[PDB]
Structure 1
Amino acid sequence: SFPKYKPSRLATLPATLDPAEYDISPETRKAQAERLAIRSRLKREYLLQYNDPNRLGVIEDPALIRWTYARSANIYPNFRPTPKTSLLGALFGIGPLFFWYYVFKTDRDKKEKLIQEGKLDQTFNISY
């Protein structure tokens, strides 16, 4: 029939094309109800604090606190040197340095060889 749509990571699958949307279980309905109850509880808490006539300041967001903490201060305590971590660290932290060292070393060696052999166009090169 019609050509099928292939989802990617940067072009995700639409909800209307998800096969699980048309196979609904009675447990799926109660999962949806529980999620809605959680959202309603959070919304009630936020709205009460938000409409408080006596509140002055910032309504602290524990989710935001946890996100900023997990992004910075909780990384090293939960880091272990594994083969994957070691290899990725060695690559991303050493490979670029030696690649650039080789590139610049080769370029400058060629430049100095031409300078010594006296066949490099250096006229008008006053400012260095």
Structure 2
Amino acid sequence: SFPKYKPSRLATLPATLDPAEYDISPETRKAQAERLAIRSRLKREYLLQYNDPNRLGVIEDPALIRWTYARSANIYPNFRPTPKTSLLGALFGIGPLFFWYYVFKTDRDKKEKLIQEGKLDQTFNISY
């Protein structure tokens, strides 16, 4: 029939094309009800605080606090030296340094060799 649409990571799958959207178990409905209940509880709490007339300040968000804490302060305590982490760190932290060192060293060696051989155009090169 019609050509199929292939989802990607940067072009996800639409809801209307999801196969699971048309196979709804009775347990799926109760899961959706529980999710809606959680959202409603959080919304009610936030709306009570938000419509409080005597509140002056910022409604602290534990979710935001958890996100900012897990992004910064919770990383090292849960870091373990594994082969994957070791190889990735070694590569991403050392390889670029040696690559750029080799590039600049080769370029400067060629330039200095040209200088010594006296066949590099250095006329008008006054500022350095």
Q: TM-score, normalised by structure 1?
A: 1.00
d(CA) in 2 for partners of 1:30 and 1:126? 79
Deviation at 1:24, TM superposition (A): 0.2
d(CA) in 1 for partners of 2:87 and 2:63? 33
Q: SS state of the match for residue 76, structure 1? A: coil
d(CA) in 1 for partners of 2:107 and 2:55? 65
How far does the alpha carbon of each residue in 1:19-71 deviate from its partner, in whole angstroms, 9 at most, with x for none? Answer: 00000000000000000000000000000000000000000000000000000
Q: SS state of the match for residue 77, structure 2? A: helix
Deviation at 1:121, TM superposition (A): 0.1
Deviation at 1:110, TM superposition (A): 0.1
Runs of 4+ in 1 over 3 A off after TM superposition: none
Q: SS state of the match for residue 109, structure 2? A: helix
Q: TM-score, normalised by structure 2?
A: 1.00
d(CA) in 1 for partners of 2:80 and 2:117? 54
Deviation at 1:12, TM superposition (A): 0.0
RMSD (Å), alpha carbons: 0.2
Is 1:60 aligned to 2:67, yes or no? no
d(CA) in 2 for partners of 1:81 and 1:97? 22
How far does the alpha carbon of each residue in 1:55-95 deviate from its partner, in whole angstroms, 9 at most, with x for none? Answer: 00000000000000000000000000000000000000000
Deviation at 1:14, TM superposition (A): 0.0
Percent of paired sites with the same residue: 100
Q: How does 1:39-78 map to 2 (within 5 A)?
A: 39-78=39-78
d(CA) in 1 for partners of 2:27 and 2:67? 30
Q: SS state of the match for residue 81, structure 1? A: coil
Q: Which runs of 5+ in 1 are unaligned?
A: none
d(CA) in 1 for partners of 2:14 and 2:94? 41
d(CA) in 2 for partners of 1:29 and 1:53? 38
Q: SS state of the match for residue 4, structure 1? A: coil
